[model samples]
Target: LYFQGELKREEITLLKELGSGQFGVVKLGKWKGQYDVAVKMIKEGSMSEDEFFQEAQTMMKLSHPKLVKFYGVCSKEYPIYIVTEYISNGCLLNYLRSHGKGLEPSQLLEMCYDVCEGMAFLESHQFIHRDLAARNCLVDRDLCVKVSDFGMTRYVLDDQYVSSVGTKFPVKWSAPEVFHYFKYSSKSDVWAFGILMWEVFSLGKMPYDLYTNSEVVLKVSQGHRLYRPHLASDTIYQIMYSCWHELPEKRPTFQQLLSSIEPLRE
Candidate 1:
């Protein structure tokens, strides 16, 4: 669920298995010295080595405090692996569910602010995280949130490990433009962030929970919008609303989102 491997092989000393699920064996505990790292191993067969490497290259460019850090990649062998920060709290989705109503308003706002910081950095660097959601983020030991799984699908592993990645989109979180032109820009990312805010305040509840994906397609385009969560303040809700404006030009930039939510954080 989160997102390298490289070196003389000596540099990467995998300790143990952290987890293995839809994303394969994200097993690990070592990197550049003793710092904790979760190594995601890709099995043999159609692994899409070049695409994976390209994704790793992008991760290299996105190493900032607000985003999950990357170390290297071990792709020059039979089984490939990528090194990344071992977030103790795992995915943000699970963290929110585990806490439920126990998380403070301040804490929730911090979660929003943390993602904004990372998204801001991505926007500034001319990068677009086509996928942005709580499930893609991870929390550290201190409960600090860091954005991950930046649309590389590097964080995913198929049982057969196919080389060709099928066309996938987070329909509920996607903006209208994505459906029409198969387009994605910083604005589309902004839309996803808005959905992510909903997930945070809803305590990891699925967006459009009462409706199916196809229904969301009809509902969202019908000028309908997600309702304000029980946990959100009016100000927070308004900022989230701004991100759903019909026109991409009408949506606020992550920079603007940061300013709006920063003051709300404790």
Candidate 2:
């Protein structure tokens, strides 16, 4: 019910291409010729207007400082557009890499803290972010992190492996139960947070850099895990390791994660 309304194409202007990923091309845009926004153009056939309409109300209800703000949707066009708050610094993954050298440990911890705060909000609301990773998160002008891609899993369902009824997950950030049994919950989100922590501590290095998706499926199932990032202190790595527990019941909730990382934010 919170969905602002269906925005008309004439109300916005696509300024420039920001980036392109599995989802498609993202652009910097302006709404009503004044407000700055990031416009995500969903490719035709990826999803339908009718299908997305139902999810928008649910997503628009989720508002938090640590989470990206959803403005509204733009239908009536072959390539539908999703308007959202524009994060000046763009993707956290690229931000970390571009600022690689001398990214202070405290700054690193702050990024982790921001994500945990955002995830905790979603957790408390009984919402699950199926996809959570550095690539899916954003860094704004103030250097604060905001978790994004709130309801985009289905948008890219066919972009990966099989379809919806089958496995369509990011293996590196997945929980054992997700790939093995196709089960997901906040616990799976917690599992992905662990991987996100490693990504931050490593200054945006891809998880399991040397392994393939299928290989990760095999190795992760065999109880193997990503090694500690060189920049992660023993205490930090310790927290990260706990998230990879074989049993989803064993991982800590996002709020508990917030409490653990809060002190280290110094």
Candidate 3:
């Protein structure tokens, strides 16, 4: 059962490191006879008990076809690990970089649609995924997209979270308000989604590649926006532009995004 603490270390066999970050190493692991699993081995002291457990608990409450499935976590003792479903194709960023040129526009539209569906679900649940980027999305063997990476996600009551302390953010993908005021909501996530769409169309090119982080802050603050990717159609680019409205209140909701992009997929 999920979140019932049914996953035991004895059943897991670490195979190889999939990825590593400040929080932990994601390893390809085998659970009993199941090899399609990823074990995120979080180092001790990387996060406090409250932070660790709270994130895990919040993840347990989420279930969507387009969202990565959380299996369970290890005991709260040393060498903490979280188990989740593994998609073989890896991150969307890599997928696009390596194979984007060959992908048809319909395929790209489908991937964006999957992300919008996932974000729509999160919006309905009042969850703000502060870090929504192409790198945070994964592709499976069937080419289905799943939204992953919940480290910066927060559950909000009034559909917003105001950071009390200054924190580093991905300057390229953040909304102007996020850069200036540290305020985050689904609308901000929509802004990031627009950038993610750009990454998809650009074949994983970095947004604002010519601008430094500080330069991006200044440029975006002055109302500068990214140009449409060469591969994007006028209709698709228009949808992306709608997400970058000057005010958060002016941006379309994820539901509207899904509706706008769904026709493009066909």
Candidate 4:
């Protein structure tokens, strides 16, 4: 939403279109005999050239098992370029919807641990994923979680700039401070990480689905977490609440979160 210039038209024909959205279209493509790749063709008029290429470079530098790898680019032509690994198993949101929510406690805990590993890896490198929701996360046949969509990601700079609104915003997954335009930070992502844990436990049901975005925003502003229904256990609920604390500074670092869930892993 903020960086509309990141995508262009000539870049569209490189792959088969998978789906389209207000901002961009995701396509299935391949590189050097590999079929596991998806190219996000940014809309012609969405973002400027500088914004698009900057993010493409950022995505290329990001190397993590939990982060989808950026293969290369085709900027020699118009509308610029990007090539990345494609997860055939699809987004976590689609997987959960077609399957079911309310998974067994053990499986739910395992998913949460996977997310923590990813987030911890990202946090260790001093990068904050502005968006971390079920739909933004992809999985392979093995069900391993990988964070996708680096367009919204930003460096942790002291300079303050407001973020652009994307086509689909997950009201339930966002942290309260983010709603207020307080500069996004690593801790804010941790807050979103906690809510994502709820989504995994619930099998991908969106929190506050019945209410309009405006109404949901109002309620969350008034101290409501927009928490999920049918929780796994009290321990997890406590962890989620601690993450949702009003003060971002009080939120736990990714390493601390990893320790909190260590026993569950064993």
- Worst 10-residue lDDT window for candidate 4 reads 1-10
Better of 3 and 4 by TM-score: 3
TM-score of each: 0.86, 0.89, 0.94, 0.83
| Local accuracy of candidate 1 as per-residue lDDT tens digits, 1-266 | 13333554677777777667344677776666767887777787535656576777765656778888877667678667667778888889999999857989889989889899988887776566667888789998877889885334332121111222334656888888776556554577788899999999999999888898889888888999999999998998998989998777788888889888877878
Best by lDDT: 3
Residue by residue across 100-207, what tens digits does model 2's lDDT show? 566888888889899999888877766666778999899998778999954443332111222224325577898887778776655777899999999999999999
Which digits, one per residue and each the tens of the lDDT, describe model 3 over residues 62-135? 87889988887885576787888889899999999999999988888888899999988888877767778998
Output the lDDT of residue 257, model 2.
88
Highest TM-score scorer: 3
Q: Against the unseen true structure, what C-alpha lDDT does each candidate score? A: 0.75, 0.79, 0.81, 0.68
Clashing pairs in 2: none
How far in Å is the alpha carbon of 134 misplaced in model 1? 0.4
- Candidate 1 local Cα displacement, residue 193, angstroms: 0.3
The candidate, 2 or 3, that scores higher on TM-score is 3
Q: On residues 151-223, what C-alpha lDDT tens digit does candidate 4 reach at each position? A: 6565563222345344335656667667776456567778888888878777777777688778877887887
Q: What are the runs in model 3 whose C-alpha is more than 4 Å off?
A: 1-6, 158-161, 164-167
Ranking of candidates on lDDT, top first: 3, 2, 1, 4
lDDT of 2 at 134: 94
